[PDB]
Amino acid sequence: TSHHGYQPFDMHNPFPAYKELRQEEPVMFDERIGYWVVTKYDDIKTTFDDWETFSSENAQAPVRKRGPQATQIMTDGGFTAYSGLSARIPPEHTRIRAIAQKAFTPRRYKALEPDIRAMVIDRVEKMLANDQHVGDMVSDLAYDIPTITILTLIGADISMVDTYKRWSDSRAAMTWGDLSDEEQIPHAHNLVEYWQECQRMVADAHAHGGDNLTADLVRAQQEGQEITDHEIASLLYSLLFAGHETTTTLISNCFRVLLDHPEQWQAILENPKLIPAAVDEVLRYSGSIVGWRRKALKDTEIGGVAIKEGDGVLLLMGSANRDEARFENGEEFDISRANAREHLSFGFGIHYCLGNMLAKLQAKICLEEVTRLVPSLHLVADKAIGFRENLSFRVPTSVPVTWNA
Ligand code: HEM
Ligand SMILES: Cc1ccc(OP(=O)(O)O)cc1
Structure with missing residues (x-):
């Protein structure tokens, strides 16, 4: 290989390539995606921290250029969204x-x-009542919980879980997937639907108020706060995606990784008080997002390597999180790791994850109840878990489990 084993969209087990990259080419230009790929903890944290030099404005730009058909669909469909928060810059971002x-x-x-x-x-x-004692922590638990949670907060109809999962899958694929122009077409239609519903909910809040985040945002604007209807709709576009997709993944990974470390699953059974530190370590070792993007606003350097104004930067937090310079025996999962919260899976600096507490809360509750109700839980078999291809999101498609009758 010419890129030290790094395959940008391959999410199944990127960590050996990350390790090679940290040692051999920690700031690597990858022409296959058009980004400087950055893998060391210190370089990544410094880049996150320096927002004045490294803008997030490309964080929501598609990795593969939007083709003619998708472009026409989204223009014709009135799609005017880009980023609620993550790819805005000061002063709009700050406000x-x-x-x-x-x-x-x-x-x-x-x-x-x-x-x-x-x-x-x-x-x-419901899972334990299955007719074979086989389950899947994704479809049987992780799929619904964060989705219903964020829908309830925003004021969306909770019967629309499946619709929001389709819209969410499409945003994730359109923006960070390796899509052909033809493959972009169903996702384009879904993005159009998604944006129309965001706008519809802002209009509905104007007309009928309510007890949710959308209505609160409209009441703020009504009380004189500077935020437009397009900006509120964009906050819904943000929260109705960021607010569940990665938490579904996190809950899924909690069971995927812990069930693969029986000794540590057993520790959790014995002492439920360890669960929040366990979630910290799952976030380090198996974060929902392994890479996030920046744009150089001027000629600058990362780790001594010259980067041009306008160059794209891919910060691989998944690699930062294993860096031996910050995490001793970084490739090992250890729920007792004292500095696990130094991880960068929520980012760092001015764009630091807005919902990190809400995400950890749901992971904790899931682990608490599942360990209480099914202490004999275990993986169906090894090599039974696949990951969807994506540049940034690392999503196990299933977590097959079984238990004792
Ligand atoms: C479940 C695990 C989650 C992970 C791993 C995650 C990760 C991230 C990351 C990497 C960023 C960008 C950080 C940066 O650029 O410095 C981010 C930002 C953001 N996240 Fe989270 N997130 C999670 C859950 C959530 C939840 C549950 C919500 C909402 C309730 C949320 C809302 C947001 C928002 C609105 C931003 C943009 C903030 C800004 O740009 O100022 N995230 N998140
Ligand atoms: C991680 C993340 C955060 C925010 C997102 O949405 P926007 O705030 O609309 O960019 C998407 C993904």
Whole structure:
């Protein structure tokens, strides 16, 4: 290979290539995707931190250029969205993030803990009633929970879980997938639908108020806060995607990785108090996002390597998280790892994940109830888990499990 084993869209096990890259070419120009690929912890954290030099404005630009058909569909369909927050830059970013944070209050979703817990228990019970004692932590638990949670917060109809998963799959594929022009066409139609619904919900809040995040955002604007209807709709476009896709993945990975480390699953059974540190280590070792993008605003350097104004940068947090310079025996999963929260799976700096607490809350509750109700849980077999191809999102498509009668 010419890129040290790195295959940009191959999500099944990228960590040996990350390791090779850190040692051999820590800042590597990859012409196959058009980015400087960055793999060391210190280089990645410094780049996140320096927002004045490295803009996030390309974080939502498609990795593969939008072809003619998709372009026509989305133009004809009134698609005018780009980024609610992640790819905005100051001063717009600063203004809109502050308004989002003030509506997205911690006390608002922690009041959903009992509903989330009851929901988890219901799914576990339904799974255990299966006619073969075989389950899948993705379809039988992780799929629904964060989705219903974020839909409830935003004020969307919870019967639309399957629709939002289709819209979410399409955003993930369109923007970070290796799609042909023809493959972009169904996703384009879905993105059009998605954006129309975001706008519809802002209009509905204007007309009828409500008790949710959308209505709160409209009430802020009504009280004089500077945020337009297009910006509120864009915050919905953001939250109705970012607010569940990666948490579904996280919950899935919690079971995938822990069930593969029986000694540590057993520790969790024995002491449920270890679960939050366990989630920290799953986030380091198996974060939902392994790479995120930046754009150089001027000639600069990363790790001593010259980067041109306008060059794209792919920061591989999945690699940062294994860097021996920051994490001793970094390739090993260890729930007791004291500095696991130094991980960069939520980013760092001005765009740092808005919903990180909500995501950890749901992972914790899932682990608490599943370990309580099915301590004998284990993987169906080895080599039974595949990952969808994507530049940035590392998504196990299933986690087949079984248990004792
Ligand atoms: C479940 C695991 C999650 C992971 C691994 C994750 C990861 C990330 C990452 C890597 C970023 C970009 C960080 C940066 O550019 O510095 C980000 C930003 C963001 N995330 Fe999360 N996220 C998760 C869950 C959530 C949830 C549950 C929500 C909403 C409830 C959320 C909402 C957002 C928003 C709105 C931004 C943009 C913030 C900004 O640009 O100021 N995320 N997240
Ligand atoms: C990780 C992430 C964060 C925000 C997103 O949505 P926008 O804020 O619309 O860019 C998408 C993915």
